[PDB]
Structures are given as C-alpha cells and as structure tokens.
Amino acid sequence: ERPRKLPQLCTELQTTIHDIILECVYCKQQLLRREVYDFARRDLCIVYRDGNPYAVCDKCLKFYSKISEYRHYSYSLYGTTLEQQYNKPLSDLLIRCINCQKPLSPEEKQRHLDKKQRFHNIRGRWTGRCMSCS
Amino acid sequence: MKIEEGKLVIWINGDKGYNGLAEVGKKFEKDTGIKVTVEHPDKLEEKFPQVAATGDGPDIIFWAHDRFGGYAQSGLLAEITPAAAFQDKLYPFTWDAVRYNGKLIAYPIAVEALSLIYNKDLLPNPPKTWEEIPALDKELKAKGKSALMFNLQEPYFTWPLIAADGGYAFKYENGKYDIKDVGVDNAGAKAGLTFLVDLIKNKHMNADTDYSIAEAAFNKGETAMTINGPWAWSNIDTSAVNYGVTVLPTFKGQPSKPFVGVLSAGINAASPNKELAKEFLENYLLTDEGLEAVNKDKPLGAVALKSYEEELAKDPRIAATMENAQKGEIMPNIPQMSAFWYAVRTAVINAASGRQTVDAALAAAQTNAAAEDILDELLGNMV
Numbered sequence A: 001e002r003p004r005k006l007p008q009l010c011t012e013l014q015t016t017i018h019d020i021i022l023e024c025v026y027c028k029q030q031l032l033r034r035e036v037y038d039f040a041r042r043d044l045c046i047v048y049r050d051g052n053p054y055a056v057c058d059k060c061l062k063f064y065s066k067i068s069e070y071r072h073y074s075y076s077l078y079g080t081t082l083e084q085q086y087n088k089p090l091s092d093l094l095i096r097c098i099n100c101q102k103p104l105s106p107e108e109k110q111r112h113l114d115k116k117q118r119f120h121n122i123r124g125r126w127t128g129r130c131m132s133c134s
Numbered sequence B: 001m002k003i004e005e006g007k008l009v010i011w012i013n014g015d016k017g018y019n020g021l022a023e024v025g026k027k028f029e030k031d032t033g034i035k036v037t038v039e040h041p042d043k044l045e046e047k048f049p050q051v052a053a054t055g056d057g058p059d060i061i062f063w064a065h066d067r068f069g070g071y072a073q074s075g076l077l078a079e080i081t082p083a084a085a086f087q088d089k090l091y092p093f094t095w096d097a098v099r100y101n102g103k104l105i106a107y108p109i110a111v112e113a114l115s116l117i118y119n120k121d122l123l124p125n126p127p128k129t130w131e132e133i134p135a136l137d138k139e140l141k142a143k144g145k146s147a148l149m150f151n152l153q154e155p156y157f158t159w160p161l162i163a164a165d166g167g168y169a170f171k172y173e174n175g176k177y178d179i180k181d182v183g184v185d186n187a188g189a190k191a192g193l194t195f196l197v198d199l200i201k202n203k204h205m206n207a208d209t210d211y212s213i214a215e216a217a218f219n220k221g222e223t224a225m226t227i228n229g230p231w232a233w234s235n236i237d238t239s240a241v242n243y244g245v246t247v248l249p250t251f252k253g254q255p256s257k258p259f260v261g262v263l264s265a266g267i268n269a270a271s272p273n274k275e276l277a278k279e280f281l282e283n284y285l286l287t288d289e290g291l292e293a294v295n296k297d298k299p300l301g302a303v304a305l306k307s308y309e310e311e312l313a314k315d316p317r318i319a320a321t322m323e324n325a326q327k328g329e330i331m332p333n334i335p336q337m338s339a340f341w342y343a344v345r346t347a348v349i350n351a352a353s354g355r356q357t358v359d360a361a362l363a364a365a366q367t368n369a370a371a372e373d374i375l376d377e378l379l380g381n382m383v
C-alpha cells in the first residue's frame, strides 16, 4: 500500500516537507506552504485519486467538514463512557478538535473529563475542542 | 403535529398512481375502520429525513429503493418482518433491493426501468442506435417534427447513455459496493455525456428540456420519441398517440444501461402504527386487487408480486421495461447514492448548457460524489 502520512510520502519521493508540492484532493489547487505544514501538524492522511497523492487545502477542509457536521452529527458522550465503549484510555483514542482537526493532546482530553464536556460523534469520528478553539 | 395513532398517512411521489393508492386506502378503511390519507408533497424524499428525525412525518414513505439506505443509516425506518410465506410471494431480486446491512428496510412494490417510447405513426421503425439520431432528427425537422425529447434536468434520464460505454456509480464485487471505486469521470462516462452534449450543440436536443416539456411534445405528436418510465404511459394513452415501448438505443454498440428502481414502501421508525402499516402493505396493497387499483391510475411497471406480474408480463410494454432493466443495473441503496445523484445532476446540467466542458463537469462530479468518503480518509486514523 501507499504512504498515508506526509513524512513517508516525502521519504518515498526523496523530498522534504519544505520542498514538496501538493494539491488539494477536492479543488486540485496547490497547497500553500503554510497548508503543507498544517496538514502534517494536524496528522491528516494523504489520499490517493487515480493513483496520485493529494492533500487538502484549508478552504476545502473547512467547507466539507462543516457540511459533514451539519448533516451527519449523531450524539455525544462523556469521556468516561468513550473509555468504557472502547476499553481504552482517552490518551489512546484519536479524538480531533471539531474546529481545527488537530488530534487532541492528553491534557486537552483530561480537561474534557475534568470539566464535564462531552465529545461529539460525527460519522463515527469522535471530536472535542482543543484549547485554541476556546 | 405528531404522528396520529390509529390512522395511516402515506407519502408517494406526484408522478405515481396516488389516486389509485387512495382507493386501496378506502378499502382498508371500509374493512378495518382505519382512515388512510395519501399525500404527494413536493420533494418528499428530502422532507422525510428532516421530519422523521424529529419523530414526525408519514407512517409510510414510498420512493425508489435508492433513497432507503440513507434513511436506515439515520435510524428513520422500522425493520420489516414479513413471514417466509409472504416473502415467497414477491420476486427475490426485489427483496434484495430493500435489504440493507442484512435487514429488510422496506416492502418492494414495483420494478421501474426507462424505455424508448416512440410514435409509431411518425416513426414505424425506431432507431436501434444513438448514433442514428442526428440524421433521423434532420429528416423529421423537414416534416415539421423532431426525433427525440426527454428530460435533461434529472440525471436518471441521461444515466443510461452515460453508463453505456462504461460509466458507473460504485463498483460492485463480492455482493458489495466499493464506495472507493466511483465511475463518474471515466472514459466511458465522458464518451456518453459528450454524445449528449453534441446532440445539443447540433440542435437535436435543447439543454432546457424538462419532464413537462418532453411529455407535452411527445403527447402532442411533435416529437417522434421520448425516454420515460411506466408511470408516463397513461397520459400517452389519453393523448391518443399510437405509441410503442422498446429497447433503448445502443451507444458504440453497447446497450444503454438504465438504473433500475424498485418503488418501495418504508415504515417510519417513529410511527405508532407499525402494525397497521404492515397489515395495510402486506394484506391490502401487495395483493392482485391492491396493485391493480394503483396500476389502473398510473402503471407501476413490473410489480414485485409474482401472481400479478405473471399477468402484466404479457403486455409488450412490460416486456420492454424488463428488457431494458436486465441490460441496466439495480440502483445501490447505500447512503452514498444521494450524493452521487446530486453530483451527476450538476454535471449533466453544466455540460449540457456549456457552463463546463464534459471533462470538467464529470471531474467535479466524481469528487462531489466521493466527498464524504474523501473526508473520512483525510481525517482517518492511519499510519
């Protein structure tokens, strides 16, 4: 199978994150350098169309994420219930911020537990909110 | 207001035999005392998931089966539990159309496929190929007529040509649809849609033609051919046009491949009348007399009930319907179907009007049809 993360894609292409030219899977526009770095920091996955690798630009990521939330929101749970459902601590679960898509840190997940803030399920994806997205 | 206990409210599309269905409801009420109200709201298939999500809506919703997986995924449909004796009364392939995640989510009613409908007085020998249409249209324009008019606003009607040389929605293998393998922007889809656009460029069709325009023109004897389903036949009858129903033209020697719909009846998960709805559907509608009452209003097509279909199959129009069906494909019922249709709708309208090239229109539709799946991958949990 093909590289799903930017570093492995960079290694296969013998390039670096500073140099790689990526296009958005949706709009096919070239990502700004800032968007390449953000893609890596948010731990997003390279997607393949017609055998070619693509990332995503910020405009399309926000557009389709907002659509997905507005159409496919399901229900919410407290963190302890997630831990019982999956039989794992929150630190071992991938829970992205609903606003910025970054995976939540363990401290942000513990903050949800302490402050009685529920996590939300959108299309089987569990989401919270990082600190920045207050 | 909330769904009323002790009555049945039914939604069915305005192109179906809703007056005939109301007659079945009248019989139900005569026998049982339970009133049945049949409504045909606009955009019922979009209204249903909205109102049913709040616990409201009709007790029973009719639509082709392609919408029902999305409803079931959202928990809006009751599971249906026909006994084995009842299941045996309907064709197995119709039950499969309404089977989602291994469970039956609706009752199948009738099998629909598009056919070529032609005016025998204007055109005794209809064309076997799409490629013949341009020359035939030039000939008919010289007589003050035209060759072909059909709805270009709904992708259901243009899909048979798009699919002919290789277009597809989702690849089907191992009894399963691969949502990651979409066939909207492949060379076969482009070839078919290019042929359609060329018909428009060359003044053999108009991009603005819709259902009403094509129906009026055919039923007035102004155009020699149309493409439509069985529900359209009774208006042609009353128009006194001498028409035939036949196999769709081939494209590049390949059959046109209509998407086959099974008109199906689902029970709202929020209905307090699930038992009455089952009694109505199994023991009043899905009988020879019940289906005949609907069919006499607007023809249903090839009904799911074997006993009645054995009579209808003797009608050459039904034989043609099933010939086209067998050359086409059963629509997926998966939740991704609606996004597929909205995406293809835009592609055909934009290409037909020249707003986009065929290539750009279909490239965008391929992406749009796959958009939620792409997002699931982007946000996925991978190494």
Ligand SMILES: OC[C@H]1O[C@H](O[C@H]2[C@H](O)[C@@H](O)[C@@H](O[C@H]3[C@H](O)[C@@H](O)[C@@H](O[C@H]4[C@H](O)[C@@H](O)[C@@H](O[C@H]5[C@H](O)[C@@H](O)[C@@H](O)O[C@@H]5CO)O[C@@H]4CO)O[C@@H]3CO)O[C@@H]2CO)[C@H](O)[C@@H](O)[C@@H]1O
Pocket: B013, B015, B043, B045, B046, B064, B065, B066, B067, B112, B154, B155, B156, B157, B229, B261, B338, B341, B342, B345
């Ligand atoms: O607002 C902008 C836009 O609105 C109007 O178009 C919209 C329609 O009014 C609306 O119903 C909706 O259409 C979707 C539909 O929701 C979706 O399910 C899908 O439809 C499929 C069917 O599911 C499928 O079964 C099949 O339908 C056949 C049917 O089986 C047969 O029995 C008979 O009834 O003919 C039907 C075909 O007409 O095929 C259709 C696909 O053709 O896709 C539809 C979209 O194509 O959304 C429409 C777009 O918003 C206005 O008409 C339009 O002018 C406006 O621009």
Ligand SMILES: [Zn+2]
Pocket: A024, A025, A026, A027, A028, A029, A056, A057, A058, A059, A060, A061
């Ligand atoms: Zn983009």
Ligand SMILES: [Zn+2]
Pocket: A097, A098, A099, A100, A101, A102, A129, A130, A131, A132, A133
């Ligand atoms: Zn955030």
